[PDB]
Amino acid sequence: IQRTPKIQVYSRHPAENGKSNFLNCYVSGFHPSDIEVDLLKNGERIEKVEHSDLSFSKDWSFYLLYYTEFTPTEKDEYACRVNHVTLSQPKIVKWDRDM
Amino acid sequence: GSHSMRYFYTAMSRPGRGEPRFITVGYVDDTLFVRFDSDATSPRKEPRAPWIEQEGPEYWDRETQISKTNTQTYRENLRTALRYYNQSEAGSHIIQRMYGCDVGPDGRLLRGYDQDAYDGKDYIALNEDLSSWTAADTAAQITQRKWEAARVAEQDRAYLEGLCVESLRRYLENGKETLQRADPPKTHVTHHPISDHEVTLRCWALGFYPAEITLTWQRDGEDQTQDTELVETRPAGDRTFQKWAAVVVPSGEEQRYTCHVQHEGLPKPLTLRWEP
Amino acid sequence: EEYLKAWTF
Numbered sequence: 001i002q003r004t005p006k007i008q009v010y011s012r013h014p015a016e017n018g019k020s021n022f023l024n025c026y027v028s029g030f031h032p033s034d035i036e037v038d039l040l041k042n043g044e045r046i047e048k049v050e051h052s053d054l055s056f057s058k059d060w061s062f063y064l065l066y067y068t069e070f071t072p073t074e075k076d077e078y079a080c081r082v083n084h085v086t087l088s089q090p091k092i093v094k095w096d097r098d099m
Numbered sequence: 100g101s102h103s104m105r106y107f108y109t110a111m112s113r114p115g116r117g118e119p120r121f122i123t124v125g126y127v128d129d130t131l132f133v134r135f136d137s138d139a140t141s142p143r144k145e146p147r148a149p150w151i152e153q154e155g156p157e158y159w160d161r162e163t164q165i166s167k168t169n170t171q172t173y174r175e176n177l178r179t180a181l182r183y184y185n186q187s188e189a190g191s192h193i194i195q196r197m198y199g200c201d202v203g204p205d206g207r208l209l210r211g212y213d214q215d216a217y218d219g220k221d222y223i224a225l226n227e228d229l230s231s232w233t234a235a236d237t238a239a240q241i242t243q244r245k246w247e248a249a250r251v252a253e254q255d256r257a258y259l260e261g262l263c264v265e266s267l268r269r270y271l272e273n274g275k276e277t278l279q280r281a282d283p284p285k286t287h288v289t290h291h292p293i294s295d296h297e298v299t300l301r302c303w304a305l306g307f308y309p310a311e312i313t314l315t316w317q318r319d320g321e322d323q324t325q326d327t328e329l330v331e332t333r334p335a336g337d338r339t340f341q342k343w344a345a346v347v348v349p350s351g352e353e354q355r356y357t358c359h360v361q362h363e364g365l366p367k368p369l370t371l372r373w374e375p
Numbered sequence: 376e377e378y379l380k381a382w383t384f
Contacts, residue, residue, distance in 0.1 A: 003219065012335045014305075026333045031219040032193055033111055052334075053134045053147075054109055054122050060195055060216045062109075067336050098291065098301070099330075099343075106377055125377070158376075165377045172381045179384040198378075215384075222384075242384045251382050258378040266376035 003061055004086035005030035007093045009079065015072050015097040023070040023095065025080035028063035036083040037066045040092070042076060072097070100279070100363060101209065102128055104267040105199035110173035112192050119177050121170040127270050127278055129309045130338070135166040142167070150274030180217050183238035192218055198225075198255075200263040206271075211259030229256040282308040282339060283364030288373045293347065300373055301345040302358030306335070313361040314344040323356075 006029040012022035023046075025037055033054055039046040052065040070078065078095035105126050112119040118137075123144075125133035132148040144162040146152045176194050186192070198213040213225040221235040223242050230252050234243040246252065271278050284304035291299045304314055310332050316323045328345045335341055348356055353373045360369040 001218070006331060008330060008333050010333065010341070012337060022336055024333070024336060026331075028331060028333075032191070033109060034191075053124050053131070053136070055107055055124050055126075055131075056109065056195060056197075058197075060219045065334050065336060098289065123377075161379075162377060165379045168379070169381055172383055176384045183384070245384075246382060249382055254380055255378070258380075262376055262378065 002086050003029055003031040005035060005082055005084050005091075007080060007082050007091060008099075009093050009095045010099065011070075011072070011095075011097065012067075017073050018071060020069060020071045023068050023078055025066045025082075025093075026063070027066070027082055028057070029061045030063075030084055030086070031061050032085065033062045034085065035062075035064065036090075037064065038081040039066060039068055040077075040079040040081055041070075043079075046070075100281070101201065101203050102267065102271055102278070103199065103201045104263060104270070105197055105212070108169065108173060108194075108196040110170075110177055110194045112177050112190075114189055114191065119174050121166075121173055123166055123169065127267065127274070129340070130274075130278060132270070132274075133162070135163070137170045142170075148274065148277075150270065150277070153273060176215075180222075180238070183241060184217075194222075195219075200259050200267060202264055202267055206264065206268050208260055208264050211256070211263065213255050213259075225252060225255055229259060277338070280308070281362070281364035282306060284312060284342075284360060284362050286358075286360055286369060286371055288358060288371050290353065290373050290375070292350070296350045297347050298350055298353065299345055299347055300353060300356055300358075301343050302360075302371060304342045304360060304362070306339045306341075307362055307364060308339050309363065310334075310340045311363065312340070312342055313359070314342055315359045316344055316346045317357050317359060318346075318348075318355050320357075 005027045008026045010024050039049050046068050049066055049068045056062045079092050081090050081092045083090040107124050109122045110119050121137040123135040132151045134147055135144050195216045200211050201209040203209050211229050215222045223239045224233050232243045234240045284307040287303050289301045316327050332340050332342045358371040
């Protein structure tokens with residue numbers, strides 16, 4: 001009836017401090033389709049984040065990619081914050097350049 | 100190689116917030132090429148890949164009309180599904196459809212699809228014979244009865260054997276630079292101590308297209324399925340995909356582990372190890 | 376290219 005989202009946060013290219021890149025939050029495996037996804041820089045919502053058109057897998061579960069341009073540094077923390085009907089509270093997943 | 104074309108419909112009711120939203124996306128393999136959204140400012144079929152942009156104005160008008168008619172069809176379907184399942188008008192429900200065709204290297208039909216789901220569960224599907232239906236329940240059996248009476252399967256077969264493989268052939272030629280180019284994975288193994296006597300070995304695959312890939316770890320030549328963490332293949336946003344597989348291994352034992360990579364862009368499967 | 380005919384449930 002309801003399926004909770006899988007969440008992955010990662011970069012388009014291998015991370016290099018001071019080098020412009022793309023920050024991605026991929027949400028997949030969820031049903032129904034309504035979902036709220038924010039990208040965060042040091043806890044604050046990044047503006048003008050774009051996302052892909054709603055699509056789904058062979059098992060009917062939905063997926064979306066949210067993305068924004070970013071220049072990673074040593075100090076700055078990034079994350080993805082996701083809410084869905086299956087979640088009683090928003091789920092925050094931190095960006096780790098090794099994942 | 101072998102190729103697929105698929106259209107994916109999502110129709111989602113939203114009582115109190117207007118008529119149900121209808122979205123269509125079309126793919127060749129793992130490449131989005133067309134989209135329609137009923138909530139768009141001036142809804143029409145829009146190109147999403149450069150090679151579809153050479154289709155003339157007649158193509159776009161015809162395709163837009165199909166989507167506008169579908170918006171109404173799938174809104175009716177949502178109303179009908181409410182009735183067949185004895186559901187209230189207060190709730191939000193979803194119908195999905197996927198349909199299209201697979202072809203081989205020679206471009207001939209391998210198989211056709213036309214499947215619908217209701218609230219994420221199978222509803223009705225065209226069988227591989229393209230001449231009969233599988234209904235998931237007594238509600239879908241009503242639809243099956245209607246579609247048998249109307250000879251819907253024959254009309255789907257004609258599309259799947261004709262226009263579906265005809266347009267896919269054309270798209271593959273027009274998009275040959277990209278659609279018929281496999282990008283192999285760029286691979287490497289990373290090594291991170293977790294603790295004194297445990298390390299994580301993570302095998303990475305980056306920059307590959309299409310999305311289909313196999314990544315596995317072996318220890319002493321034996322598959323390590325249970326103790327491998329494998330993430331879902333994920334889009335990079337530049338057409339390509341990424342994936343990794345990780346295993347936690349005892350310190351000093353790293354050389355007993357091998358990562359194996361299979362992808363259509365590789366002429367032979369690759370074997371990788373941690374390289375200190 | 377899509378198919379222009381769709382029958383309802």
